[PDB]
Amino acid sequence: MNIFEMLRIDEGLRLKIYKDTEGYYTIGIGHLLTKSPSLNAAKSELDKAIGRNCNGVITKDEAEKLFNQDVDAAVRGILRNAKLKAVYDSLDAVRRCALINMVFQMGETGVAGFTNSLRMLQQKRWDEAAVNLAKSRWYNQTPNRAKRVITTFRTGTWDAYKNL
């Protein structure tokens, strides 16, 4: 299992504009298009992103190209953020996958707000960090995905997805 398969499980694949759990306009594999209410603003962002007139619809190929870009951007973001990179460097390969997942979902800024949890991960206090991470809007809003990530940080194995 690798980062791509993991995220594919968490976000799903949709070839037509859709609304996310938050109600925002998304396409493909969790690619946020705009927090704007206008489907029109969304279609415009979408054509800008693909370089063609899509009329709200993209092929698999296109969806995958977006996905490659976004995972790349997530990793580079971690590597550019001081707080984030310190954590990342301290972690094993599976746990690193879990941090990437959070970054892809909630952006750099968002994750960097998890001060206390990040400190605990750095200290390798797995159980404790797992319990703190669950005390978030994130967990209350998308509990099943959040639990899958949390277990990944807790155990350091792919168990939560070995199911899926």
Curated annotation (Swiss-Prot):
Q: Per UniProt, what does mutating residue 26 to E do?
A: Complete loss of activity at neutral pH; covalently bound substrate
Instruction: Indicate where this protein is primarily found.
Output: host cell
- GO MF annotation list: lysozyme activity
Entry superkingdom: Viruses
Q: What is its EC number?
A: 3.2.1.17
Name the chemical reaction catalysed here.
Answer: Hydrolysis of (1->4)-beta-linkages between N-acetylmuramic acid and N-acetyl-D-glucosamine residues in a peptidoglycan and between N-acetyl-D-glucosamine residues in chitodextrins
Q: Tell me which positions the record assigns to the signal sequence.
A: none
What does the pH dependence annotation say?
Optimum pH is 7.3.
Question: Where found in the cell?
Answer: Host cytoplasm
Fetch the CDD domains from UniProt: T4-like_lys
Question: For binding substrate, which residues are annotated in this chain's numbering?
Answer: 32, 104, 117, 132
Keywords from UniProt, A to Z, are:
Antimicrobial, Bacteriolytic enzyme, Cytolysis, Glycosidase, Host cell lysis by virus, Host cytoplasm, Hydrolase, Viral release from host cell
UniProt family annotation: Belongs to the glycosyl hydrolase 24 family.
Q: What does this protein do?
A: Endolysin with lysozyme activity that degrades host peptidoglycans and participates with the holin and spanin proteins in the sequential events which lead to the programmed host cell lysis releasing the mature viral particles. Once the holin has permeabilized the host cell membrane, the endolysin can reach the periplasm and break down the peptidoglycan layer.
- The protein's name: Endolysin
Give the source lineage, highest ranks first. Viruses, Duplodnaviria, Heunggongvirae, Uroviricota, Caudoviricetes
